[PDB]
Design a protein around this ligand. Structure first.
Ligand SMILES: CS(=O)(=O)c1cccc(Nc2ncc3cc(-c4ccc(Cl)cc4Cl)c(=O)n(CCO)c3n2)c1
Ligand SMILES: [Ca+2]
Ligand SMILES: [Ca+2]
Ligand SMILES: [Ca+2]
Ligand SMILES: [Cl-]
Ligand SMILES: [Mg+2]
Length: 456
């Protein structure tokens, strides 16, 4: 039956080639059922593999678990006899490098918006023991052509698994001196972010040169200056941050967390909700109450399809709200950020906050935090703040069904567990017997749809 199913070719349809990037070619594919468009990375196995396939799929699964508004999202890892297909989210805003050429320089307010996002993502990777090792504006992408949309760190984590064959001069600006000597610790990323921040505020690399040689000579010494005329107008806080990031010795260099919490970042990045946000903000809270009222099985099903099958355009309204609720700018919503946001929501309507808000969130946190990470990441937030009618469109339920049905036509009780277990991690077969009108014992597509609509 599967003899002619293609795994990757079964689900996706290649549309065009975007480019050729180090490890492999990068294509724009399109889901055949849902019509959503993604970016896939095709990497020839025989030519690129340093390790075995079991080890590779282990690393890429770890990457599929990274949920941060400023880190690339990988949906799945397919495979055929010749290549690995790494399906990920498509970003259409271009490289930050192009944004630097257009604007040529950034006010401290704008540069703090961009760099705050690079710090939050880099902090997330480091906590998950991931080092970019090649952080530069060419590997940061704006998610859209909207004005102040998020940036996205891409192209990382593949070094241990694959081999790269290759604009090398561009990379020389951002390497740390210890890389010239063979070290690639977490601190090398902080350095790169510091060179980026220097470039945002002046338009000149701190270690400059027309060729690869001269640049590397200035990097080795680690000497830079604020001598350009345009630095006379730039604040002392900014310079103190750049100096801390470009400390020669990694042991004395500050961390990504220290970059994010630096005062300069707090001064120019205090985004907060306004009266205009009230419509979308109230829709999120109402759907979050409906979330906790639903059962554990229903909540896990909504999280599976909110994290595996949605796209950012559908959640553009909720992306802005999530950003405004993220006071510490670490990319996640802790308990305190939910209570304060729910309180401001009251003050903007004109209602007194005085079941209390604090005791509501206390009960709501275990339900939304289905991974137990201590905070609500973006996927869990949209799973609860989104209109369920959106999540359960027909085309999106078709894909869900085919994901679990190995073989054809029928979903076993065992095969069905994959949906709920992937999210909640907590054996109720009641919904199975209720969803099976034909007494078949397995759930075809129409019984599958009826089951999901009850969860709404
Ligand atoms: C090429 S392009 O023509 O410049 C061009 C035009 C217009 C848009 C894009 N967008 C884009 N969106 C997502 C991605 C994801 C990856 C990627 C890397 C490593 C792993 Cl493990 C998984 C993934 Cl999915 C990627 O490599 N690239 C290519 C570099 O940008 C990606 N590009 C690109
Ligand atoms: Ca460059
Ligand atoms: Ca937070
Ligand atoms: Ca969580
Ligand atoms: Cl100095
Ligand atoms: Mg049946």
């Amino acid at each position: 039956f599967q003899g002619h199913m293609g795994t990757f070719a079964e689900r996706y349809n290649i549309v065009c080639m975007l480019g050729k990037g180090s490890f492999g070619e990068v294509l724009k594919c399109k889901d055949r059922i849902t019509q959503q468009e993604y970016a896939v990375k095709v990497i020839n196995k025989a030519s690129a593999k340093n390790k075995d396939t079991s080890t590779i799929l282990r690393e890429v699964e770890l990457l599929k678990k990274l949920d941060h508004p400023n880190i690339m999202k990988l949906f799945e890892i397919l495979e055929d006899s010749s290549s690995f297909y790494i399906v990920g989210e498509l970003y259409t805003g271009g490289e930050l490098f192009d944004e630097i050429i257009k604007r040529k320089r950034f006010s401290e307010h704008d540069a703090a918006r961009i760099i705050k996002q690079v710090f939050s993502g880099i902090t997330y990777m480091h906590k998950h023991n991931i080092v970019h090792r090649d952080l530069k504006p060419e590997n940061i992408l704006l998610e859209s052509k909207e004005k102040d949309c998020d940036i996205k760190i891409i192209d990382f984590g593949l070094s241990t698994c694959f081999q790269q064959n290759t604009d090398r001069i561009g990379t020389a600006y951002y390497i740390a001196p210890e890389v010239l000597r063979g070290t690639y610790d977490e601190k090398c990323d902080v350095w790169s972010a510091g060179v980026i921040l220097y470039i945002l505020l002046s338009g000149t690399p701190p270690f400059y040169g027309k060729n690869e040689y001269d640049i590397l000579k200035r990097v080795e010494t680690g000497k830079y200056a604020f001598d350009l005329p345009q630095w006379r107008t730039i604040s002392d806080d900014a310079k103190d941050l750049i100096r801390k990031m470009l400390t020669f010795h990694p042991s004395l260099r500050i961390t990504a967390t220290q970059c994010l919490e630096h005062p300069w970042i707090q001064k120019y990045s205090s985004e907060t909700p306004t009266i205009s946000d009230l419509p979308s903000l109230e829709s999120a809270m109402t759907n979050i109450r409906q979330f906790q009222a639903e059962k554990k099985l229903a909540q896990a099903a909504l999280l599976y399809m909110a994290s595996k099958l949605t796209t950012l355009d559908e959640t553009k309204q909720l992306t802005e709200i999530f950003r405004k609720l993220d006071t510490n700018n670490d990319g996640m919503l802790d308990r305190d950020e939910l209570v304060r946001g729910y309180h401001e929501f009251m003050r903007l309507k004109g209602v007194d906050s005085n079941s209390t808000i604090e005791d509501q969130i206390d009960s709501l946190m275990p339900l939304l935090d289905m991974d137990g990470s201590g905070s609500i990441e973006y996927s869990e937030f949209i799973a609860s703040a989104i209109d369920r009618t959106i999540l359960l469109s027909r085309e999106r339920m078709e894909r869900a069904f085919k994901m679990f049905d190995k073989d054809g036509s029928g979903k076993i009780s065992t095969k069905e567990l994959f949906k709920l277990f992937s999210q909640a991690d907590s054996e109720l077969e009641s919904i199975i017997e209720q969803v099976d009108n034909n007494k078949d014992g397995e759930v075809d597509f129409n019984e599958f749809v009826e089951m999901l609509q009850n969860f709404v």
